[PDB]
């Protein structure tokens, strides 16, 4: 299945994923498209930030679901 | 060291801090990776509310010590 990732600069990327894919893997598949390191990426879904350990099936994310990209500023 | 900050919804947040970090620092890290401003943050450890201006060693926060976060809205 594929899900949408929308960013604050208007870029809409549709990334082919799987319910078993972890959030660390979907972030790793975004840097291959834009170059943003996974540590900066903050994925937002239904007003909740996806944790770096769980899979996107723990959040019941379905096909054609939209994710919002937020970038950290300092890290750590 | 890695500490955890859980909320009331059930989300756990893993932070990699140091025993000498101040509480204004750990609130800044929560804002940086979760977006909530520090004014809406209230850290609880063993029922005691964390007072801004003290290091994590003042509250004897070992590694993997789970903190609790409640919003101020």
């Amino acid at each position, epitope marked *: 299945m594929q899900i949408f990732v929308k960013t604050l600069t208007g870029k809409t990327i549709t990334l082919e994923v799987e319910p078993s894919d972890t959030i660390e893997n979907v972030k790793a598949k975004i840097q291959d498209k834009e170059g943003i390191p996974p540590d900066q990426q903050r994925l937002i879904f239904a007003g909740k930030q996806l944790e770096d350990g769980r899979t996107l099936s723990d959040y019941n994310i379905q096909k054609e679901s939209t994710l919002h990209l937020v970038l950290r500023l300092r890290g750590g | 060291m890695q500490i955890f900050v859980k909320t009331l919804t059930g989300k756990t947040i893993t932070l990699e801090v140091e025993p000498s970090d*101040t509480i204004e620092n750990v609130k800044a890290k929560i804002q940086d990776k979760e977006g909530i401003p520090p004014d809406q943050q209230r850290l609880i450890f063993a029922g005691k509310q964390l007072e801004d201006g003290r290091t994590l060693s003042d509250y004897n926060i070992q590694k993997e010590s789970t903190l609790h976060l409640v919003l101020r809205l």
Partner: antibody
Amino acid sequence: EVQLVESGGGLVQPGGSLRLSCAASGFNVSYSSIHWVRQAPGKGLEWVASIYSYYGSTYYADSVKGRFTISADTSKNTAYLQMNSLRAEDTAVYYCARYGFAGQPETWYAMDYWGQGTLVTVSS
Amino acid sequence: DIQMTQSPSSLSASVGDRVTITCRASQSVSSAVAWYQQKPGKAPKLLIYSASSLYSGVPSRFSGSRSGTDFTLTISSLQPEDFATYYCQQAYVEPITFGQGTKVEIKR
């Protein structure tokens, strides 16, 4: 594969204007932070301005507030620094640096890559 | 704001000596401190970021450390190509401030 190329520096009379450009390659300015640091002759490094192009946040130092305008064009992947009302104390080597993730996870961000530096000289 | 204070201002140690550079922070900065090296006539290069993390491409003889508001840059095998000026940086609050600098020369 990532580098920052600067331009715009040179000689200018006090009170004149200069626009420094910072061409970026290997990354997207619209997703990274770009700062400016100057070094006066015989002095150390002083922070000038900064941009967080993802949100549009710009910050300045009290010594250049109201005179310098920092901007970023995403189309050509370039960050600009419009310097106005230049004084003699502005003569320095201005650097363009990217601020962000530096390699190890769960670590604070730092300025990893810098430009070669351009020289702005201000005198009559 | 938050200003760094480096010590000492200048050093001189022979090849192989272990030299430390002290950087004292104004307020609490956490680990948001980076070390930079500026060789004469070149741009500042990043050495140690996030208080103690080593950057890719920097020799392993450079290291950083944190203890409260104090940060130390240490070089184990001081080589002739280490003559430069070293600046600690504060990347916590946005008015970014550097250290005064530390010129290190080789004792010959």
